[PDB]
Amino acid sequence: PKHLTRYLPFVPTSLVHETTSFLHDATKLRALLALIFSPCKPEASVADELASPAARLEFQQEKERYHAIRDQHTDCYRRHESAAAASMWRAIEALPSDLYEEAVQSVTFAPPYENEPPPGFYHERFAFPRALMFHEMYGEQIFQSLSQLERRKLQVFMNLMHVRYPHAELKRDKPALFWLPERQVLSR
């Protein structure tokens, strides 16, 4: 073996071309900024009005109504979660002394990382199925119920996500590319 090697995380510049190009473009940048600032209306003068007094009152009323109804709806549930939560602790405290350690663990429990030199109850690694996904399991039904604007926003969200994570697959398939020696890292 080499007997002396230490790698550190590294992101090659060639793999991030999409992100870089998107960011450096002024036309796109401006648009991005615009999207962040939805109204983009002047707010630095007394002679400014977003809405007339008559328009705001209906908004207020609707908001109030919405909230009023939703609270009422939700309280019923809240009581149930409460009730349910009551029982879990009871059962946990009732377990034997030797089984207590396993009753205070998370779903994603895993052993600590071991940096071995170069050449129980935990059985399987945590892996959330895709099937169980809300979006996964209800996308087809919701998709058809989406509106024009909704669809538009969906498209834009997709685009932005893609932009943010271009090399997701690349990383997955060839993780070793995203690694460089410590001496090379600390001398860039």
Binding site: K28, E62, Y66, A91, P129
Partner: protein
Amino acid sequence: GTSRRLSLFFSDPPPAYALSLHAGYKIQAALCVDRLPLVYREPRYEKRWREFKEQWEAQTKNGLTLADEITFMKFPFHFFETEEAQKKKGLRSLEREPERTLYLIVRYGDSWQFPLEDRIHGQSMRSTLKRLCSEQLGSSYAPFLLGYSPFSYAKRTYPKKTKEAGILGRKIFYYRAHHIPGSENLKLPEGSPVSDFAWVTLQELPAYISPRKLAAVSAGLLLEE
């Protein structure tokens, strides 16, 4: 095999392993497999509010500023376009009551209940669960678990006669799980104690189990009033 059922319930046939006791009560484990609905539904107010907000925004010109340079990106997944341009086995099936939360129940001989299994001294509860699932339910059956802690427990004492054996009673610790969509149904092995299985709703649940059994887990199930 009735011997396994008798060894499970009663203590007359001794098992082939050492049992784990707790204050004279043997530790047990259970499982409850539930399924999510298949059809999406929305409240009434939600729609109203949404519609109103959309309309108002549109009217007042207060909506998001979506540029043409972002929304028109050439990507493989592209399905978007302008509308103007567009003009150019009655209780064992998994497809029962799509808009309901179905619960799994087994039948021990002539009694409807949840699966049960004893805990081996030195073994973990997850191991017990695993074994339970792989022996009573099906060989290739492996539902997704929600956690390691239980949610409910109960106590069951033996009559005055069987108490002379040495075991005072039982200790059950109920557990919850979910059914992975797209998976097959159960497959009872030849050497399993379960005689039958069925999927039932919250509403119909009380009609199978006794109140005693009902109450022990009524505070852990989902609310569908």
